[PDB]
């Protein structure tokens, strides 16, 4: 007949085809390849978004990486010898605005390491899922968990309460816990520990958090900036018209300023020219492109928007350039010039540290990882199984046990490589829509991720306004869970609203979950006491 | 029979009963009184929330009422005569932190005016609806437009782009516009001008906006404070541990500070003691009290939470006191000590000013008032008519012509008295449930508002953490509109999400609507262009 059908029959009748059970699942070899291609197309925006978001965390960079700076900017530090001229030893302020050039270079190196680590963790998770579990599920570091890890647990440039190494240790312990509770088979049981309204509204809260991240300056398009009174107003004026903030002291006459050692912000307050920053408008154009491609059911909408914005930003001498005429910009362009590069992780791999176990914030972060990973994993696996028709009358899909162990092992490996916990994604459904039924789809996605290596220079040149609109639209897609919340019932509307609004407003998934669980418990205390008295018999 | 039944039969056969059509609507006199009481109880939280929010707008006064301050705080301004000692002329910074004692005298005096103006607008609006339209609809300044008028159009202490007097002129003209388009009868027709996702998600966006205000410091319980990096984190540390911010200049060596004339913020940045401010915990207790009463279907849930928090804050020497041991706090207690007082509006009444018509921000606010009021009034009235069974097969409720013209007339009067536009509340549905059918219910609510006067001292003593949880819980109830947004459709999910999220993030209803309408128009340009070519005939 045709060469394509000959290939399909040869693969299906071979040992590898029988091992993957292609015949018993009615999926051919090329069907699995097409499903993997579609899954990678709908998933590959991670290679930009997750790597950049983890890059904001600062990685393993510390104050030791900041170089001493001369008294005046006009003299290079080696020539900083003269009257009234001295070199300033770095402090904790070296990490934040104005960022020490040494710390910035360390952050770029960490960005390359984290691109490679994210790709490697996704590859290893996909391979484990395809081989050990034999399911068309593609694994990659999660969106909300990654954002929580970077901006809340470790914070921007390590401003959080837990260091990056200790957060990696938390992720590793979380993976070990999942391995333990999935070897027994209790993950389905712990999928009911959390309250229902919290369970549904956590996704919408995480989506709002991601959209708010995408509406900021350091990794979004702008449009949300500091306000002295209202605390948040319309940003997206040009970067030349943005100024920093430092804490001050007020008195009954005038504002005698400068609390010494105060943490100066970035460039968040807009002085004039609102709605005029070209980077924000380029982000809006990419947003429109992604939105149209999502409306038209075009696979890779996120990819097309990111690529368009990044390619416009790759030009050297524009206002939207990703390589400004600076030493750091010149280095970024020099690294981007070599299109293909094989990068070896040097700082992030094996960067675990169990020193901060005793701290309360460590356990808060670990419990948050447990809760969020449980919700995402149990929801997505059963949604996928319903998509693929693997759900029987009992409600299981045969390989669920190995699927959960694969996810836990992939989380452990990602922690060892130095990334946020890795999930099966909802976009895996795309492959299932394309006919993907066996683990060969995961193998194909892993091969695509492998080819996504040797392209670190193209992935490290993706600007913030390119990361940008993908976050907003990911939040839009996550928002759809609000439909099955009974907003008429206050016992369910109040905890759900509280969770959903605290995640973006406290800027913390942990704080949103804690607030929602506390509100649920408080609002149901009366009912639980009534039921306890009824069981005891004081009431009828 | 009974004296109660004798009263019902006497009025029903009287001229007043026949004019109100009690017999033809099967509602008795006491039924309207119970309905009016239930409507007032369900909506009485405006007497706390409304006046407080408009008070933050700064009212009518300006830097002219800030008093000159001595060089040092330790010397009273009259005794400010000595070597190196001088009186500081007030500037625009007198209005903001640290607030000039002269300007702080306004807000207390303006708050008393805005308590009466809120009641008088509510009283007159209820009477006109009760008499001219004969419907059980209670009119009061809207919750969402209140916050937009105070915090966005005029801004906190007049920091916005439009002065309070000009914003009143916007409301007056905006009131005239409906009076014109309701006399013709087109207000039903303009209910379709807005896109469907924008109309539905505007309520949820406003609810997020209102809950966002309830989580701030100047009008809420706290728990949301400034962050140097993330721009929002967990506030609600004690007020002694909050510090201000002033814009600064960064260089390549160090942050040489103080952009001269920069707008110093309030007390938004928390240094330590997070989750330890007693005022926030008092608000949470009030939040729990309202939530349980809302759950238990207890009428007046908002008031009980407001009253309990306000009553605890009335004690003089606690950490949650509403009258701190200051000169302003002593004056607040002195005015509170006289329980009953008849207040005459002296600054706010008739404070219109058409000087700023030519400015663009004036028309942005006026059109935003026009849009917001169209969605609120048309949606509420038909929901009320469905509740009261006044909707015929044609979909009208007979007295709709005067119902819209009554609402327009009340808005004009409210602007003259100096409040935000007044609407029929959704809480008007409450009295309809107990049997409110004629305009006598509105008269009864009007009488209660009359009794709400002579209690300005008790209403001007309501602290920010008492306003607080009602705003959060009003945001919860407004959030129920999300259920009829097709979140599967990106042509509706994206504009709805954008509309919903910009209102609390840009912290502006106008920006949320402009973004949502712009996103709706852009995302439908391809479809409209396709159908335009189909009508022309280039396509099939
Ligand atoms: C860092 O370099 C700046 C110059 O940009 C220095 O700024 C000083 O502070 C203000 C702002 O310019 C001026 O009034 C001073 O004259 C500046 N000093 C000098 C010598 O020009 C600042 O001195 C430098 N900071 C440190 C710690 O050396
Ligand atoms: C305003 O009040 C302060 C006291 O709170 C006055 O004293 C100044 O305080 C700052 C530090 O808080 C010192 O750096 C200044 O040297 C102090 N000034 C003097 C003369 O001692 C301050 O003088 C007052 N400022 C104005 C403009 O009146």
UniProtKB/Swiss-Prot annotation, chains A, B:
Keywords: Membrane, Transmembrane, Transmembrane helix, Transport. Disruption phenotype: Resistance to 8-azaadenine and 8-azaguanine but not to other toxic nucleobase analogs. Deficiency in the uptake of adenine and guanine. The keyword Transport applies. Pfam families: Xan_ur_permease. GO terms for cellular component: cytosol; membrane. It comes from the Eukaryota. It is a multi-pass membrane protein. It is found in: Membrane. InterPro entries: Azg-like, NCS2. The keyword DNA-binding does not apply. GO terms for molecular function: purine nucleobase transmembrane transporter activity. GO terms for biological process: adenine transport; guanine transport; purine nucleobase transport. The chain crosses the membrane at residues 35-55, 114-134, 166-186, 204-224, 243-263, 275-295, 303-323, 362-382, 397-417, 442-462, 463-483, 497-517. Belongs to the nucleobase:cation symporter-2 (NCS2) (TC 2.A.40) family. Azg-like subfamily. Transports natural purines (adenine and guanine) as well as purine analogs. Confers sensitivity to 8-azaadenine and 8-azaguanine (8-azg). This is Adenine/guanine permease AZG1. It comes from Arabidopsis thaliana. The lineage of its organism: Eukaryota, Viridiplantae, Streptophyta, Embryophyta, Tracheophyta.
């Amino acid at each position: 007949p045709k060469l394509l059908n000959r290939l399909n029959t040869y693969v299906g009748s071979s040992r590898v085809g029988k091992r993957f059970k292609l015949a018993e699942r009615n999926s051919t070899f090329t069907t699995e390849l097409r499903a993997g291609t579609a899954t990678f197309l709908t998933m590959a925006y991670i290679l930009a978004v997750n790597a950049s978001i983890l890059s904001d965390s600062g990685g393993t960079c510390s104050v030791s990486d900041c170089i001493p700076l001369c008294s005046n900017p006009a003299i290079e530090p080696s020539q900083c010898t003269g009257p009234g001229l001295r070199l300033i030893q770095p402090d904790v302020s070296c990490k934040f605005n104005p960022v020490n050039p040494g710390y910035a270079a360390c952050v770029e190196e960490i960005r390359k390491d984290l691109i490679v680590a994210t790709v490697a963790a996704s590859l290893i998770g996909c391979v484990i899922m395809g081989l050990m579990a034999n399911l068309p599920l593609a694994l990659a570091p999660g969106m909300g968990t990654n954002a929580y890890f970077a901006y809340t647990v470790v914070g921007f440039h390590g401003s959080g309460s837990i260091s990056y190494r200790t957060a990696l240790a938390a992720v590793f312990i979380e993976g070990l816990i999942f391995l333990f509770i999935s070897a027994i088979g209790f993950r389905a049981k712990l999928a009911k520990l959390v309250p229902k309204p919290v369970r549904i509204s956590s996704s919408a809260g995480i989506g709002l958090f991601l959209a708010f991240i995408g509406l900021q300056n350091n990794q979004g398009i702008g449009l949300v900036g500091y306000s002295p009174s209202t605390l948040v107003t319309l940003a997206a004026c040009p970067a030349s018209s943005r100024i920093s903030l430092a804490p001050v002291i007020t008195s009954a006459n005038g504002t005698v300023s400068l609390l010494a050692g105060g943490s100066v912000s970035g460039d968040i307050m807009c002085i004039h020219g609102r709605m005029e920053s070209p980077t924000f408008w380029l982000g809006i154009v990419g947003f429109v492109i992604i939105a149209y491609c999502l409306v038209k059911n075009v696979k890779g909408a996120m990819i097309y928007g990111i690529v368009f914005v990044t390619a416009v930003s790759w030009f050297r001498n524009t206002e939207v350039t990703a390589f400004p005429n600076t030493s750091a910009g010149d280095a970024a362009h020099d690294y981007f010039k070599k299109i293909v590069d094989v990068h070896v992780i040097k700082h992030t791999a094996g960067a675990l540290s169990f020193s901060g176990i005793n701290k309360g914030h460590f356990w808060e972060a670990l419990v948050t990882f447990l809760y969020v990973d449980i919700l995402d994993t149990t929801g997505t696996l059963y949604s996928m199984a319903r998509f693929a028709g693997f759900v029987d009358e009992k409600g299981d899909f045969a390989g669920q046990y190995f699927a959960f162990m694969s996810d836990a092992s992939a989380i452990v490996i990602g922690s060892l490589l130095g990334t946020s916990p890795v999930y099966v994604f909802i976009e895996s459904s795309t492959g299932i829509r394309e006919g993907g039924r066996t683990g060969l789809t995961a193998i194909t996605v892993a091969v695509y991720f492998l080819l996504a290596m040797f392209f670190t220079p193209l992935l490290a040149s993706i600007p913030a306004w390119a990361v940008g609109p993908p976050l907003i639209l990911v939040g839009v897609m996550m928002m759809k869970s609000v439909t099955e919340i009974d907003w008429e019932d206050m016992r369910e509307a109040i905890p759900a609203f509280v969770t959903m609004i605290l995640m973006p407003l406290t800027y913390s998934v942990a704080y949103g979950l804690i607030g929602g669980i506390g509100s649920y418990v408080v609002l149901h205390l009366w009912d639980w006491g009534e039921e306890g008295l009824v069981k005891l018999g004081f009431l009828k």
